[PDB]
Design an enzyme around this catalytic site. Structure first.
Site, PDB file in Angstrom:
ATOM      1  N   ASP A 126       0.849  -1.183   0.000  1.00 17.40           N
ATOM      2  CA  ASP A 126       0.000   0.000   0.000  1.00 17.40           C
ATOM      3  C   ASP A 126       0.886   1.234   0.000  1.00 17.40           C
ATOM      4  O   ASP A 126       2.144   1.141   0.037  1.00 17.40           O
ATOM      5  CB  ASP A 126      -0.982  -0.027   1.173  1.00 17.40           C
ATOM      6  CG  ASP A 126      -0.310  -0.140   2.520  1.00 17.40           C
ATOM      7  OD1 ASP A 126       0.893   0.165   2.676  1.00 17.40           O
ATOM      8  OD2 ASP A 126      -1.020  -0.535   3.489  1.00 17.40           O
ATOM      9  N   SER A 127       0.257   2.392  -0.095  1.00 16.08           N
ATOM     10  CA  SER A 127       1.043   3.583  -0.354  1.00 16.08           C
ATOM     11  C   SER A 127       1.594   4.218   0.943  1.00 16.08           C
ATOM     12  O   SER A 127       2.497   5.063   0.916  1.00 16.08           O
ATOM     13  CB  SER A 127       0.158   4.594  -1.063  1.00 16.08           C
ATOM     14  OG  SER A 127      -0.576   5.256  -0.040  1.00 16.08           O
ATOM     15  N   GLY A 128       1.039   3.816   2.089  1.00 12.75           N
ATOM     16  CA  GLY A 128       1.494   4.300   3.383  1.00 12.75           C
ATOM     17  C   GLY A 128       0.644   5.443   3.874  1.00 12.75           C
ATOM     18  O   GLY A 128       0.704   5.832   5.060  1.00 12.75           O
ATOM     19  N   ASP A 146      -8.140  -7.379   0.514  1.00 12.67           N
ATOM     20  CA  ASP A 146      -7.219  -7.585   1.613  1.00 12.67           C
ATOM     21  C   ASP A 146      -7.978  -7.170   2.848  1.00 12.67           C
ATOM     22  O   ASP A 146      -8.846  -6.290   2.779  1.00 12.67           O
ATOM     23  CB  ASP A 146      -5.989  -6.677   1.525  1.00 12.67           C
ATOM     24  CG  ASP A 146      -6.317  -5.214   1.833  1.00 12.67           C
ATOM     25  OD1 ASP A 146      -6.718  -4.483   0.923  1.00 12.67           O
ATOM     26  OD2 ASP A 146      -6.173  -4.785   3.006  1.00 12.67           O
ATOM     27  N   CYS A 187     -13.651 -27.626   6.853  1.00 15.21           N
ATOM     28  CA  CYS A 187     -12.392 -27.009   6.535  1.00 15.21           C
ATOM     29  C   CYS A 187     -11.247 -28.004   6.334  1.00 15.21           C
ATOM     30  O   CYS A 187     -11.045 -28.919   7.151  1.00 15.21           O
ATOM     31  CB  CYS A 187     -12.034 -26.010   7.653  1.00 15.21           C
ATOM     32  SG  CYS A 187     -10.424 -25.139   7.423  1.00 15.21           S
TER      33      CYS A 187
HETATM   34 ZN    ZN Z   1      -9.481 -24.999   9.499  1.00 13.80          ZN
END
Ligand code: ZN
Ligand code: QEI
Ligand code: QEI
Ligand code: ZN
Lengths: 365, 365
Positions: B92-94, B262, B300
Site C-alpha cells: 500500500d502507499s502508506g 485484503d 475445513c
Molecule cells: Zn481450518
C-alpha cells in the site's frame, strides 16, 4: 515396546549414552526435554518440536491442574491427544511451582495465582493427564538450607516418595504403562544425599532425579554436589537433573553421570532475544545485528538458520512480533538438541572429554 | 513470465475469474491477500501462508518505513528476501495509516507513533522494498464527507495519481518489473466516482482500486456505491477493493465485479478468538467450546482442523499462548482461501449466483 527399559550403549568416565524404550517411543540419552507449560511448548507446534530432534517433552502439572484442569484433560482423551504430541511426556509433580500456602505432612494447600496437592493427588493428576514418566511428589528445600532443615525436608520427601510409589502402584493402568522416578534431596550435604539415595533405592524406582539444585548455588557448587551425589544413585537407571539448563551446565553434568535435563531457558530465552550459538549466547535485539545477514549460528542445521537472517529476527523481536518468538524458540530448542546429539556421539566414540574441552574453549572464547 | 498480464477465463454477470501473471508468480482471481504488517503475516511463517493457498500478500508501507526502514530493507536485499516470501507482494502507499500531521498539496509530514510522504516518496519506498504491485499515493476521504470535501479530495488524489504514475515510470527497474494500480475516490457520490474513473483511465494503470469504502458506511451503502462505481473502471484490468474484509462483503463485492481483496480481519480476529466457519463466525473463548472435540469448522481442509480441537484452541487462547494465535490465524487465512477457491470454481462453472445464495443461507442461518 516395553513399559520401560533403559540400556546403556557406551560409557566414558562417568558419562553414559544409551536409550530409554517406552510404549510411546525411544528416548536417546543424554536427553534434553523441552518444557510444555500449559499443554504447549511455547510458540511451537508439536511437529516442529519433533523436527528439532526432541524425543520427549516435559509437562508442568501445576499449570495443567489449574488450567485447563486435570479431570478436563482426562475427559478429552489425555494430554497427548489434547496437545497433539504422541511421544513420551514426563510430568513434574506440581509441587515446585506451588512454592514458586499451608504445608503439612499430608501435602500442601494453596491459592491459584483454593487447591490441594499431596503425594496421592499429584500421582492421580499425572495419571489423569496420561503422563509416561511420573515424578514422585517431594518437598522443596530452598537454597541455602541449614543442615537441620535440609534433613527434615529430605526425610519428609522420602516419606512422600514411598507414598508416591504406593499410589502409582495402586492404579493398574498407570503401573502397567508408565514409569515412576524418585527425587533425591539433601541440599548440599553429602550425608543427607547418601541417606536420600539409600531410601529411594530401598523403595525402588524406574529412574532417579537429583532434586534441589539450580536454586542459586552457582555452577562450581552444583558440580561439587553432583560429584558425590550421582554415584550414590543406582548406576543402571537413568539420572535426571531437574531444572538444569545452560549448555555448559549440561556438558559438566553429563561428565558427572547425568542422563536427562529440562529447562525453560531456551524457550524463555528465545522470546527475550537470547539466541544460543557455539560461540556463546547473543542477544538478537542488540543494534549490532540490525544489518547482519548471517544466520543466528553459522553451523546450526535448523530450519531458521537455513532461511532467515539475524537482521530479520532482530527486527521481529524488536517489533514484538509473534514470528520472532517462533523463530527464536525453534532455533534455541534445535541448538539444544544438536548439543545433545554431539554429546551422545562423542560418548559413543570415546571422545567426549575432548568434545567438552573443545566446546568450552569456543563457547567462552 | 511477463511483468503483468491479466486474463479473464470466465464470467457470470459482473463476476469474473481469471489470473494475473507476474514475474514472481501467478495470482488467481478473485484473490484474497493476507496482510503482512511489519514484514510478517502475523504468527505465520511464509511457507504456512503459502500452504493455505495464498498467491500474494500485502505489505504495509507505513509500518515498514518506520520499522525497520525502507532504505535498510533495500540494503538487505529487498522485502521478499528479508521476510522469506518469494511470490508477488502488493504494497500500500502508506498514506492511509498516516491518517489512522501536516497535509498539503506536496504530501504529508507526520510524527511516528518526524517523517514525510509525498507521491514521489511513496513510490520510492515501494521501489526500495521491491514491491511487485505498487499503489498510487492518494488522499484519504473520511466517511462521511460533504460533496465539496469529497470532490476536493478526489481531485487532489487524481493529481497525485498522475504524480505517482510519472514517479514509477521514471525508475527503469520499477517500470520494467512491477505494476502500478490507481485508486478511485469520490466517497459515495456517483458523479465524483465517474470523474475519478475517467481521470485514472486517461492516465492509465495496470489495475484499479476502489478506495474510500469500508469506512463506516455499512454494507448496504457500500454495495450501492460498488453497483455504480465498478462498471466505471476499465473492464479488462483488475479491480481491487481496499480494506474489505468480511466473508459476506467479499461474496457481494465479487458479485459486483471486484477481483482482489485484503483485510486484517482474519489475522486480527484470529488472535482475538474469532474463528470463521461456514455457519458463521464463532468466538473460541466462549465456555461452550471448553470440552468441544470437533475442529473449528467441520468441512475445513486446513492443517489446524485436521489436528486440533476447539477445546484445545479455546484453552490456548484463554491462556494467552502463542500457539493459540498461530493456530487461529492459520485456520482463518485458510478459510478465506477456501472461500476464494469456491468463488473461483463457482464462477468458472457458471453457478456463482447459486453459490452466493447457498453461502448466505448457511452463514446467516
Ligand atoms: Zn481450518
Ligand atoms: N519436584 C521438583 N521440581 C523441581 N524443578 C526444579 C527443581 C530443582 C526441582 C525439584 O527439586 N523438585
Ligand atoms: N491508500 C488507501 N489505503 C486504504 N486502505 C483501506 C482503504 C479504504 C484505503 C484507501 O482508500 N486508500
Ligand atoms: Zn538455528
Amino acid at each position: 515396546r516395553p513399559r520401560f527399559s533403559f540400556s546403556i550403549a557406551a560409557r566414558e568416565g562417568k558419562a553414559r549414552t544409551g536409550t530409554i524404550e517406552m510404549k510411546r517411543g525411544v528416548i536417546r540419552t543424554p536427553a534434553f526435554m523441552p518444557v510444555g507449560t500449559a499443554a504447549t511448548v511455547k510458540a511451537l507446534k508439536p511437529e516442529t518440536v519433533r523436527a528439532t530432534g526432541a524425543d520427549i517433552i516435559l509437562g508442568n502439572t501445576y499449570h495443567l491442574m489449574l488450567r485447563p484442569g486435570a479431570e478436563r484433560i482426562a475427559k478429552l482423551g489425555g494430554l497427548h491427544s489434547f496437545m497433539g504430541w504422541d511421544r513420551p511426556i514426563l510430568t513434574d509433580s506440581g509441587g515446585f511451582q506451588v512454592m514458586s500456602t499451608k504445608q503439612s505432612e499430608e501435602g500442601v494447600t494453596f491459592k491459584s495465582h483454593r487447591h490441594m496437592l499431596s503425594p496421592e493427588r499429584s500421582i492421580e493428576i499425572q495419571h489423569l493427564l496420561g503422563s509416561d514418566i511420573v515424578m514422585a511428589f517431594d518437598e522443596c528445600t530452598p537454597y541455602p538450607a541449614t543442615p537441620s532443615r535440609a534433613a527434615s525436608s529430605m526425610e519428609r520427601s522420602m516419606r512422600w516418595a514411598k507414598r508416591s510409589r504406593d499410589a502409582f502402584d495402586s492404579r493398574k493402568e498407570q503401573a502397567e504403562n508408565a514409569a515412576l522416578f524418585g527425587i533425591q534431596q539433601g541440599s548440599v550435604f553429602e550425608n543427607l544425599r547418601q541417606q536420600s539415595a539409600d531410601a529411594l533405592a530401598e523403595i525402588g524406582f524406574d529412574g532417579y532425579a537429583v532434586g534441589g539444585l539450580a536454586g542459586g548455588e552457582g555452577q562450581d557448587e552444583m558440580f561439587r554436589v553432583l560429584d558425590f551425589s550421582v554415584p550414590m544413585l543406582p548406576d543402571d537407571k537413568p539420572h535426571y537433573l531437574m531444572g538444569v539448563g545452560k549448555p555448559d551446565d549440561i556438558v559438566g553434568a553429563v561428565e558427572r553421570g547425568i542422563d536427562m535435563f529440562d529447562c525453560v531457558l531456551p524457550t524463555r530465552s528465545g522470546r527475550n532475544g537470547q539466541a544460543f550459538t557455539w560461540d556463546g549466547p547473543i542477544n538478537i535485539r542488540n543494534a549490532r545485528f540490525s544489518e547482519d545477514l548471517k544466520p543466528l549460528d553459522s553451523e546450526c542445521h535448523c530450519a531458521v538458520c537455513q532461511k532467515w537472517s539475524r537482521a530479520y529476527i532482530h527486527h521481529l523481536i524488536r517489533a514484538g512480533e509473534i514470528l520472532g518468538a517462533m523463530l527464536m524458540t525453534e532455533h534455541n530448542i534445535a541448538f539444544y538438541q544438536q548439543l545433545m546429539q554431539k554429546i551422545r556421539d562423542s560418548i559413543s566414540e570415546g571422545r567426549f572429554s575432548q568434545f567438552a574441552q573443545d566446546f568450552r574453549a569456543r563457547y567462552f572464547a
